[PDB]
């Protein structure tokens, strides 16, 4: 029970943060974004396994959550990396793209603008480091409704409730009024729907891409998940 | 300021609820769903105009919110209508479909299952009538980030904050602990991302449909919005 205690949970999530990922480049923008995502997924899996209680979930729930959440978690990390730089998306060290470079690939400008506007909202709310760590973990745990709708099910609700309690604790430490605490929790959680919207649009765009101009991220992810079951 | 007061706001939303809509039927499932949506949009516009402060927003914000939110608001009303009936989707009086009827149209079963699982989550949480009225209005107001990221912008934040305060008031009246209040607010708002996910999948499916087997809902909606500007 103390591993899921707020201060301790926050500090555990801080140490599970993924490393810096480089594209390390030797049709090009899409190849770079998909190659980058495949490299980051490796570390996302590692991060998930470090969230207190995640590996105590059934294997079925662990895999369903990872397969559903990947673009959302990737995009939430992108938004945190780009928070202090209006008009820029810091995909990686590295791979810094300006909004206007989205004009070169059909369908991408729309996705860049949604990403930049969501990032702007988190900048305006002055998202804290401790709040970002809770939110990103909530994105993985709230990704698939199925796992919630028995032993493993009880557990997922409990785990999502503990991260939420941590977020509530972080907001209370800010010293603001009870009304303002309630409002800040609502403003942050309403933004989760905008991160989900971006991920859905990104996935739709990727699925509409011609196979030759892209790394097959999803199939590579499934191989990773099979590789981690065996 | 008292029009946006919690008890009064809830009671105003209750009276702005749309009427029952019938398909009134004289390739068929998709025609029925799209004909139904076009009829409901007429009343959705009317409902929006009755939410305190909505018509005080700039015309640009009113139209952007309506164009972005339509499938989400339609689907949240569907989920409320179907809440007490596992395995059934009560699209309208009527037009009651069983989960298995989704098997007949390609791509629809996936959307029916997401709708039925989200509906199941709201049933498990025992969503109250007063909570549903606040949530549906929050779905319209949180639909587009753009309008938030000056006079009309200030206003949208204020309006979204008032509905949120109403929801917080409703949850507090339930008598549960402060921790439980925080947790219930989080559980409901996290479900908004699942309603957004369903709407995105529904829109993608509709856009992939062959024009002859569907009513052109979106173009009809734009005509309604132009018809209401003029
Ligand atoms: O944003 C992305 C990303 C992406 C990559 C790394 C990140 O950290 C975040 C997103 C990957 O593939 C795409 C593929 C697409 O077709 C469209 C997209 O917007 C993306
Ligand atoms: O669910 C819907 C609805 C719909 C209709 C009425 C409602 O109250 C809610 C959703 C309309 O068009 C679609 C069109 C689609 O291609 C797929 C869908 O799932 C839908």
Curated annotation (Swiss-Prot), chains A, B:
User: Which parts of the sequence belong to the NR LBD domain?
Assistant: 5-228
UniProt subcellular location: Nucleus
* Top-level lineage group: Eukaryota
Quaternary structure, per UniProt, is:
Binds DNA as a homodimer. Can form a heterodimer with ESR1. Interacts with NCOA1, NCOA3, NCOA5 and NCOA6 coactivators, leading to a strong increase of transcription of target genes. Interacts with UBE1C. Interacts with AKAP13. Interacts with DNTTIP2. Interacts with isoform 4 of TXNRD1. Interacts with CCDC62 in the presence of estradiol/E2; this interaction seems to enhance the transcription of target genes, including cyclin-D1/CCND1 AP-1 promoter. Interacts with DNAAF4. Interacts with PRMT2. Interacts with CCAR2 (via N-terminus) in a ligand-independent manner.
Q: Which family does it belong to?
A: Belongs to the nuclear hormone receptor family. NR3 subfamily.
The record comments on the domains as follows: Composed of three domains: a modulating N-terminal domain, a DNA-binding domain and a C-terminal ligand-binding domain.
Disease implicated: Ovarian dysgenesis 8: An autosomal dominant form of ovarian dysgenesis, a disorder characterized by lack of spontaneous pubertal development, primary amenorrhea, uterine hypoplasia, and hypergonadotropic hypogonadism as a result of streak gonads.
Its annotated function is as follows: Nuclear hormone receptor. Binds estrogens with an affinity similar to that of ESR1/ER-alpha, and activates expression of reporter genes containing estrogen response elements (ERE) in an estrogen-dependent manner.
Q: What is this protein called?
A: Estrogen receptor beta
Its gene name is ESR2
């Amino acid at each position: 029970l103390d591993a899921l205690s707020p201060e301790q949970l926050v500090l555990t999530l801080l140490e599970a943060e993924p490393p810096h990922v480089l594209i390390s480049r030797p049709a090009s923008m899409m190849m770079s974004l998909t190659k980058l995502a495949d490299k980051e997924l490796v570390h996302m899996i590692s991060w998930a396994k470090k969230i207190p209680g995640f590996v105590e979930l059934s294997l079925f729930d662990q895999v369903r959550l990872l397969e559903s959440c990947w673009m959302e978690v990737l995009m939430m990390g992108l938004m945190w990396r780009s928070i202090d730089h209006p008009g820029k998306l810091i995909f990686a060290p590295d791979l810094v793209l300006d909004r206007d470079e989205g004009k070169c690939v059909e369908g991408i400008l729309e996705i860049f603008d949604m990403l930049l506007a969501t990032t702007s909202r988190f900048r305006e709310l002055k998202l804290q480091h401790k709040e970002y760590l809770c939110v990103k973990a909530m994105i993985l745990l709230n990704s698939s409704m199925y796992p919630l709708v028995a032993d493993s099910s009880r557990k997922l609700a409990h785990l999502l409730n503990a991260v939420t309690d941590a977020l509530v604790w972080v907001i209370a430490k800010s010293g603001i009024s009870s009304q303002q605490q309630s409002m800040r929790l609502a403003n942050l959680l309403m933004l989760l729907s905008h991160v989900r919207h971006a991920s859905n649009k990104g996935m739709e765009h990727l699925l509409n891409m011609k196979c030759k101009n892209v790394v097959p991220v999803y199939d590579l992810l499934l191989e990773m998940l099979n590789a981690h079951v065996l």
